[PDB]
Amino acid sequence: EDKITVHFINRDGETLTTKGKVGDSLLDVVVENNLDIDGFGACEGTLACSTCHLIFEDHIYEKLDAITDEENDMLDLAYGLTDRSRLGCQICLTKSMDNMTVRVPETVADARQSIDVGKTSAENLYFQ
Amino acid sequence: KITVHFINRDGETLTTKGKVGDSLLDVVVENNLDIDGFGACEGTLACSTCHLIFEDHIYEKLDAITDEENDMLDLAYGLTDRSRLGCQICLTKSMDNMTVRVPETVADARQSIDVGKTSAENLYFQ
Numbered sequence: 001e002d003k004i005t006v007h008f009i010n011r012d013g014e015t016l017t018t019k020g021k022v023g024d025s026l027l028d029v030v031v032e033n034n035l036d037i038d039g040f041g042a043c044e045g046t047l048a049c050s051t052c053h054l055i056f057e058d059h060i061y062e063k064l065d066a067i068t069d070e071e072n073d074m075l076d077l078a079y080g081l082t083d084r085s086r087l088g089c090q091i092c093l094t095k096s097m098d099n100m101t102v103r104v105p106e107t108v109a110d111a112r113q114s115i116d117v118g119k120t121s122a123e124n125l126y127f128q
Numbered sequence: 129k130i131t132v133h134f135i136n137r138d139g140e141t142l143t144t145k146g147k148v149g150d151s152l153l154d155v156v157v158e159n160n161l162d163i164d165g166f167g168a169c170e171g172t173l174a175c176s177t178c179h180l181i182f183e184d185h186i187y188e189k190l191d192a193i194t195d196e197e198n199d200m201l202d203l204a205y206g207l208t209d210r211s212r213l214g215c216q217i218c219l220t221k222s223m224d225n226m227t228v229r230v231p232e233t234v235a236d237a238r239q240s241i242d243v244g245k246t247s248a249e250n251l252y253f254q
């Protein structure tokens with residue numbers, strides 16, 4: 001089976017070009033080529049995190065396998081979910097993906113300006 | 129067996145009992161507490177779904193957070209200064225009758241899905 005080219009736009013805004021085998025997941029591509037993306041693929045592709053979140057080009061997105069309920073559950077928890085988002089670890093390379101660009105979106109940690117004040121209730125100590 | 133109170137996302141209190149040494153994920157799971165989606169990664173420090181909020185005094189004396197826990201706790205939605213990952217917090221006799229809260233998920237917070245863009249341009253400057 002042949003190899004194809006995939007471009008990644010990093011959170012940094014830097015473009016990484018790499019080559020992946022047809023049939024490999026985009027997570028596999030990130031890992032097997034040791035790309036500079038921090039935090040990506042925490043659950044190691046077992047549909048238990050949202051860290052493999054990627055954004056796809058219009059015409060690639062349109063052609064992706066229908067999203068399973070399982071994926072959708074975890075995709076709902078992706079930070080900054082878009083109408084071109086999928087979990088990269090469920091998306092397998094096809095020949096028609098050659099020279100596509102996917103973007104790695106920012107995490108909740110990148111956007112967070114402050115840590116909230118934690119609280120178990122609004123209840124006044126006097127009452128409690 | 130010690131008693132823990134969970135304040136659910138609905139605002140409702142669930143009271144349940146856990147063995148010493150069990151994690152709070154353990155407790156949630158073993159007693160089938162209706163908490164949607166809590167502990168996806170089954171306690172392998174690979175999600176943020178076991179996020180819980182603790183009382184001041186309990187929080188302070190919890191086991192020192194590890195880097196592994198902290199990397200994932202950074203990815204929790206609505207991180208608080210009283211937040212930890214429940215799958216890493218084990219019951220002690222001293223925790224009997226404490227209260228924790230389950231914070232809302234990003235999906236609960238969400239009012240709409242955004243427009244996806246691989247990238248932007250301001251061709252006003254071509």
Ligand code: FES
Nearest residue numbers: 043045049052089
């Ligand atoms: S790696 Fe965890 S869901 Fe894709």
Ligand code: FES
Nearest residue numbers: 169171175178215
């Ligand atoms: S259960 Fe996934 S990290 Fe706690």
Ligand SMILES: [K+]
Nearest residue numbers: 112114115116
């Ligand atoms: K905040």
Ligand SMILES: [K+]
Nearest residue numbers: 239240241242
């Ligand atoms: K939105």
